Amino acid sequence: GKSRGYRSGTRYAFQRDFKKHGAIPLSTYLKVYKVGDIVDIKANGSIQKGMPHKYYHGKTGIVYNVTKSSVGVIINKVVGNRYIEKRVNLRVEHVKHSACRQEFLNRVKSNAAKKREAKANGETVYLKRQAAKPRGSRIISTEGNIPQTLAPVAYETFI
Amino acid sequence: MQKEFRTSAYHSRFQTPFRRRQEGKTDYYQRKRLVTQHKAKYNSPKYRLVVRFTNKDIIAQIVSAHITGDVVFTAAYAHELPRYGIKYGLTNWSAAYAVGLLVARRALQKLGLDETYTGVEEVEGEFELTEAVEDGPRPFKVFLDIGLQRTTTGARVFGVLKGASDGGLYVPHSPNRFPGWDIEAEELDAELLRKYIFGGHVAEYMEELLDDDEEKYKSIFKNYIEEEIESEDVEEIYANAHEAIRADPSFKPTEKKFTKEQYKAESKKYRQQKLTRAERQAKVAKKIAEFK
Amino acid sequence: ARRPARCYRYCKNKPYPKSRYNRAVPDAKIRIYDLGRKKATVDEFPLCIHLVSNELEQLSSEALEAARICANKYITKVSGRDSFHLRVRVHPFHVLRINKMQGMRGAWGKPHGLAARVSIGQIIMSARTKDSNKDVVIEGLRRARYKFPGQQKIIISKKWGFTPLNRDEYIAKKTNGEVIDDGAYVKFLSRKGNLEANLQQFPNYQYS
Amino acid sequence: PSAPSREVVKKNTSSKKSDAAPASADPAKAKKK
Amino acid sequence: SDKSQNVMRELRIEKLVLNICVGESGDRLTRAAKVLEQLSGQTPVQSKARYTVRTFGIRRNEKIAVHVTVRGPKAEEILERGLKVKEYQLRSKNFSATGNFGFGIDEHIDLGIKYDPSIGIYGMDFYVVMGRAGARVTRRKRARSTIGNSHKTNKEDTIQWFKTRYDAEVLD
RNA sequence: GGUUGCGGCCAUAUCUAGCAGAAAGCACCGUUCCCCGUUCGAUCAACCGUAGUUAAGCUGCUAAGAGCAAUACCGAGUAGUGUAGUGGGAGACCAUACGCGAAACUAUUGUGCUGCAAUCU
RNA sequence: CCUAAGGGGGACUCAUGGAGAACAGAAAUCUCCAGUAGAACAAAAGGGUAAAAGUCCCCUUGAUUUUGAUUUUCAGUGUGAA
RNA sequence: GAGGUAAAGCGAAUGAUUAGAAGUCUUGGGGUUGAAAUGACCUUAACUUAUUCUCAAACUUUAAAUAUGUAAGAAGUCCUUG
């Protein structure tokens, strides 16, 4: 007999972290979520109300609704050959702001600051990020660092 | 014969509670229920009336919670009462009422809701909530946080409750925990509550003790004796103070006999300092050598 | 009764131990893992000789028992029962299953026996003895090798007895007062913890 | 007279014999014989 | 500082607990409760069996024993009244490692109360809980903590205090 | 800098055994008329701040302390693993090529930081 | 299966071990200390829970009314459940 | 961001498991002490302490590789105020 209940296979996913059981620290309840915020979903096993399904554990989405104790998050899930928009109601204990927003929102500010200064100096600045390039030429000094010769070592048993 | 319990594995797997729970000071269940705000009232804070009693002091603070820590809006302490004319019994039920009234008036002064929301100017002990004025700002809403202190009908925390409510703050409450509440006949005897507001119980103890046990009366009510304060003029001490509390509720800090730097320099002399790594290494080497 | 060992030679299944889920499991044929003078002190037997696996393989408890008996018999016959301490280093914890003891329907088997799952380079048997007793102990293990399937190597250890220290580091820690007897094994000095207890337990500790 | 009763603090809901009450764990009360 | 001869280190009785474990429920337990209310002047409380034992003739939640706690001067008076029956002679194996001691009388009329044939005689159990000032630390709600090692009550201190305050003997 | 009230992170904060603690605070501490709660004013309630004490709590310091935390020419580029071959081997398995890469272990260092308000030799 | 074993609030801390107290003993009741949960939470197993979700006490019927949205199984149909 | 598989671990929890050593038996027996004292001794077996060999699909503090969610702007960012 197969069993396919709602929380099947969540033995380790919904467990609390080691030495982290019990009450929720209240910064979780002091965070403010606005429509359009990007949030990570991670089910807290100790709060069983407003709990996400195991599919959304580890997914990231857009807040579309804000209620008394919960947020509505939009998730795109693959069903066959397309994506379906899923609307999940989650209590804020299972939700955290995505840290990818704060990094990109800082690059927007930095680009704006760099661009305005270049206009003040009448010069140009390039704001596109670049991949790591192959390193240039260089000269290796050997004063105090004369090359040491290594050889493969013979076989030994150490038991 | 039995297994030693405090093993290294016992300590390794032990999960210490929250720092302020292990101190036995914060009830985080109640704190979560008090602090958490409706998520659609995004950054609007909930304001708590923190009321704490020490052996010598009454602390009343209006607090809003933030991620970096709680932020005090205003604060009134019982040791401020001598400025207002109450010098003894700084932990009466009536001192609690006075502290609540003071913090309410001070907060309303800070906000600007003084002329609007004056409160109960003629304290008769009736149960009443600060009702909003039509076509005007709503009264400052504050929730009572009694912490770990037990809820009993007649407790002093509800004295600060009644004082703050009469001071013009909107603090949601019921009258079934006030002194003078008849639990069998579910109505509040406002006469006994008014008695408690103006030190009536203390004055009656003074009068009842003076004619029965004068020696105990001399020790318990010393300050009243050297102040020539009898029972019949106890009430005015509170009754005037209320008026005085309403006349100038602004906070006047105590003038400090020394500066911050002087306090720090004085205190730093009586603070032992951690041994350097070399010092304890030398101690270990000496202890080894003296072992031969 | 027993199928040929070739039917259970390879680690094809996940480990299947006794648990609350399989309970009617027979006992392993091997019950004794320490033979010879197992109470000898560490200093009495400096030489260690291993029988090492060159196979990722399963060894039945029957083979473990047979090899143990063969090695013990030979070494006690040639050098005496107190000239060595033999230790079997693999315990059979994996349960083999048998089906026949219809067709393929409902074919989940019943417990049939026990086997130890050994890796490449895993020590099967260890023998601590004196140096002068080398050629005997080796010949004791070389016979025991015949009771096992696969390839095994007889390797003379670099270490002192069953200790994790080389035969030179042990002597250094011994003349420095950092080693005390514990019956058949030893305890080594620690530079951590209560200084007074450490000093009391190792009085001859020449501190540097 | 009033009749208050001692309240229950334990959680053992089972109505059975308790832990560590075995026979032969006791000494010989008649060892003096 | 850290003076052992400090005023607040004074040993004194915290409470005296009087136990009568009559094995049954009904008239005998009610009369034992009457005896306890007579001796202490306080309404006692009845204890229920935690589980069923056929050998002892008790069953779970059957009201078996009755006990009462007395504190203050009355505890001291009852304690010395019971020590009179013991003729002021306890044993070294009557004091616990935590500094408490107890004894057991066998007839409750030796204490000095009127005997009634209807009531009969019940034995009685005496236990004294010793403690210094500051035990409220371990019993208060807020900021509850433990008592420091020097402030703890132990067997030797309680034995010496008992010998001094009652001029009695602790038979080692 | 100490202390209190309310906290954030939730042991670098816990645990064991010792020692010290000026000022204020906190605390223990005293009492039972009153509101209130108990078998018990022990807890809880109220009253006095008066009679006393730093003994305990609390705070800090000590320990080749237990635990915890962090780091690393520590182990170890090891174990494992993605990709490849008409590679080896009877097989079990293994080596090599282009990549990713632990855990234990070992050693060293540390042992709460901090927000708001009030207060203090 | 459950008018509580549902809902709210309050108070308390569990399994177990050690040391003590007449009968009383390995197991009755009382006391202190230790006790990160080694207990309990109707019923399988897993997860969750310590000033509680456990134990006890007080009050109750939100196990109510109206009809939408959403998650799982999914065809993104029904039913069940949330 | 999420994960708990490979590996690893077991002088870390749970469960399994080999060997000694040192202590306590006061809440194990046999023998030997006693004209009787439960008050010693020899022994095995128990526990306790620090160690020791080996393990887990339905164990675990730790924890990959591969695979997997989101973001990388004009429907954006900032300023003022309806």
* DSSP-derived secondary structure letter, D5: B
| Phi–psi pair at A99, nearest 5 degrees | -80, -5
CA distance B125 to B158: 13
CA distance D15 to D18: 9
- Exp. method: cryo-EM
**Candidate from B14, B18, B39 with C-beta closest to A71:** B39
C32 touches strand H (CB under 7 A): yes
Residue C144: HSE in the Cβ half-sphere, 13 Å Cα cutoff: 35
For C191 and F84, how far is CA from C1' in angstroms? 51
> Is the CB of D16 less than 8 angstroms away from the CB of E37?
no
Nearest-CA residue relative to C1' of F22: B270
CA distance C110 to C99: 6
> Is the CB of A157 less than 8 angstroms away from the CB of C159?
no
Task: Output the CA–CA distances (angstroms, integers) from residue C188 to A122, B8, C177, C178, C191, in the order listed.
Answer: 74, 20, 9, 6, 10
Which nt is closest to the CA of A13, judged by C1'? H3
- Residue of E144, E63, E30 whose CA lies nearest to D7: E63
* DSSP-derived secondary structure letter, A155: P
Nearest-CA residue relative to C1' of F68: B12
Whether C141 and chain A come into contact, CB under 8 Å, resolves to no
User: Does C touch D (3+ CB pairs < 8 Å)?
Assistant: no
User: Does B touch D (3+ CB pairs < 8 Å)?
Assistant: no
Nearest-CA residue relative to C1' of F10: B18
Q: Angle B164-B167-B172 (CA atoms, 0-180°, nearest 5)?
A: 45
For A12-117, strand residue ranges (E) read 38-41, 60-66, 70-79, 82-91, 95-97
Q: What's the Rg (C-alpha) of chain D? A: 18
Which residue matches tokens 């103890």?
A: B205
Whether A158 and chain C come into contact, CB under 8 Å, resolves to yes
Residue A41 contacts by C-beta under 8 Å, 6 or more apart in sequence? A52, A56, A57, A58, A59, A60, A61, A73, A75, A88, A90, A94, A95
Q: Do the Cβ atoms of A72 and A89 come closer than 8 Å?
A: yes
Residue E159: strand, helix, or coil: helix
- Residue of B223, B225, B203, B205 whose CA lies nearest to B213: B205
Which residues 63-82 on A are within 7 A of strand H at the CB atom?
76, 78
Q: Do the Cβ atoms of E122 and E65 come closer than 8 Å?
A: no
Q: Angle B114-B38-B40 (CA atoms, 0-180°, nearest 5)?
A: 100
Dihedral sign, Cα of residue C9, residue C10, residue C12, residue C16: positive
Q: How many residues does chain A have?
A: 159
Of B280, B283, B286, B288, which to mutate for an interface test with C (greatest number of C Cβ within 10 Å)? B288
Distance from CA of D25 to the nearest CA of E (A): 17
Which are the residues after which chain C is interrupted (C to N > 2.5 Å)? 101
Residue B36 contacts by C-beta under 8 Å, 6 or more apart in sequence? A26, A29, A30, A69, B46
Q: How many residues does chain E have?
A: 172
Instruction: Give the helix ranges, DSSP H, for chain A.
Output: 27-30, 99-121
CA distance A92 to A66: 10
Distance of CA C152 to the CA centre of its chain: 14
CA distance C114 to E132: 64
Residues 98-157 of A with CB under 8 A from C: 157
| Cβ-based contacts of C199 with chain B (< 8 Å) | 288, 291
For E44 and F40, how far is CA from C1' in angstroms? 10
CA distance E103 to E125: 6
C84-93 residues labelled b (16+ CB within 10 A) or e (exposed): bbbbbbbebe
| Cβ-based contacts of E145 with chain B (< 8 Å) | 24
Strand pairing report for E89-91 and E169-171: parallel
- Residue of C183, C168, C158 whose CA lies nearest to C85: C183
Which nt is closest to the CA of B95, judged by C1'? F47
Task: Output the CA–CA distances (angstroms, integers) from residue B270 to B257, B264, B267, B280, in the order listed.
Answer: 20, 11, 6, 21
Chain B CA closest to residue C198: B288
User: Does E touch A (3+ CB pairs < 8 Å)?
Assistant: no
Distance from first CA to last CA of chain D, Å, rounded? 49
Residue E155: HSE in the Cβ half-sphere, 13 Å Cα cutoff: 9
CA distance B100 to B114: 16
Cα torsion A119, A121, A122, A125 to 10°: value is -70
Instruction: Give the helix ranges, DSSP H, for B23-139.
Output: 28-35, 81-84, 93-111
Chain E CA closest to residue B24: E143
Dihedral sign, Cα of residue E132, residue E136, residue E139, residue E145: negative
CA distance B147 to B60: 12
C179 touches strand H (CB under 7 A): no
Task: Centre a 10 Å sphere on the Cβ of residue E68 and count the other Cβ atoms it contains.
Answer: 20
Q: Do the Cβ atoms of B102 and B80 come closer than 8 Å?
A: yes
Task: Output the CA–CA distances (angstroms, integers) from residue B246 to B96, B98, B115, B240, C93, in the order listed.
Answer: 16, 10, 11, 10, 83
Whether B3 and chain C come into contact, CB under 8 Å, resolves to no
CA distance C67 to C146: 8
- Residue of B71, B160, B169, B62 whose CA lies nearest to B113: B169
Whether A125 and chain B come into contact, CB under 8 Å, resolves to no
Strand pairing report for B143-145 and B47-53: parallel
Residue E89: HSE in the Cβ half-sphere, 13 Å Cα cutoff: 3
> Is the CB of C52 less than 8 angstroms away from the CB of A158?
no
> Is the CB of D4 less than 8 angstroms away from the CB of E63?
no
CA distance E152 to E132: 8
| Cβ-based contacts of B288 with chain C (< 8 Å) | 195, 199, 207
Whether B48 and chain A come into contact, CB under 8 Å, resolves to no
Which amino acid is it at B157? V
Residue B30: strand, helix, or coil: helix
Q: Which nucleotides of G are covered by protein (CB under 7 A)?
A: 9-37, 39-41, 46-56, 69-73, 75-76, 80-81
Resolution (A): 2.7
* DSSP-derived secondary structure letter, C82: T
Strand pairing report for C186-188 and E12-20: unpaired
Residue A95: HSE in the Cβ half-sphere, 13 Å Cα cutoff: 28
- Compute the 3-state secondary structure of chain B and give helix, strand, coil in percent, each to the nearest 5: 40, 10, 45
CA distance B225 to B217: 9
Residue C137: strand, helix, or coil: helix
- Residue of B158, B160, B178 whose CA lies nearest to B97: B160
Task: Output the CA–CA distances (angstroms, integers) from residue E49 to A13, C120, D18, E62, in the order listed.
Answer: 44, 63, 12, 5
Whether B147 and chain E come into contact, CB under 8 Å, resolves to yes
Q: Do the Cβ atoms of B93 and B196 come closer than 8 Å?
A: yes
Q: Do the Cβ atoms of B115 and E110 come closer than 8 Å?
A: no
> Is the CB of B147 less than 8 angstroms away from the CB of E144?
no
* DSSP-derived secondary structure letter, C159: B
Which residue matches tokens 């709060």?
A: A47
Whether C155 and chain A come into contact, CB under 8 Å, resolves to yes
Instruction: Give the helix ranges, DSSP H, for E53-133.
Output: 73-85
CA distance E124 to E145: 34
- Residue of B219, B225, B237, B204 whose CA lies nearest to B94: B237
- Residue of A47, A43, A48, A41 whose CA lies nearest to A24: A47
| Cβ-based contacts of B36 with chain A (< 8 Å) | 26, 29-30, 69
CA distance C44 to C162: 11
For C109 and H65, how far is CA from C1' in angstroms? 35
- Residue of C36, C56, C50 whose CA lies nearest to C115: C56
Strand pairing report for B71-77 and E89-91: unpaired
Residue B84: strand, helix, or coil: helix
> Is the CB of A26 less than 8 angstroms away from the CB of B42?
no
C185 touches strand H (CB under 7 A): yes
CA distance E25 to E20: 12
| Phi–psi pair at B18, nearest 5 degrees | -60, 145
Distance from first CA to last CA of chain E, Å, rounded? 35
Which residue matches tokens 């291993």?
A: C50
Residue C193 contacts by C-beta under 8 Å, 6 or more apart in sequence? none
CA distance B48 to B147: 11
Which amino acid is it at E111? L
For C201 and H17, how far is CA from C1' in angstroms? 30
Residues 38-97 of B with CB under 8 A from C: none
Nearest-CA residue relative to C1' of G13: D9
Chains contacting chain B through 3 or more C-beta pairs under 8 A: A, C, E
Whether B43 and chain A come into contact, CB under 8 Å, resolves to yes
- Residue of C148, C144, C143, C141 whose CA lies nearest to C115: C148
Q: Do the Cβ atoms of B246 and B109 come closer than 8 Å?
A: no
**Candidate from B14, B35, B43 with C-beta closest to A26:** B35
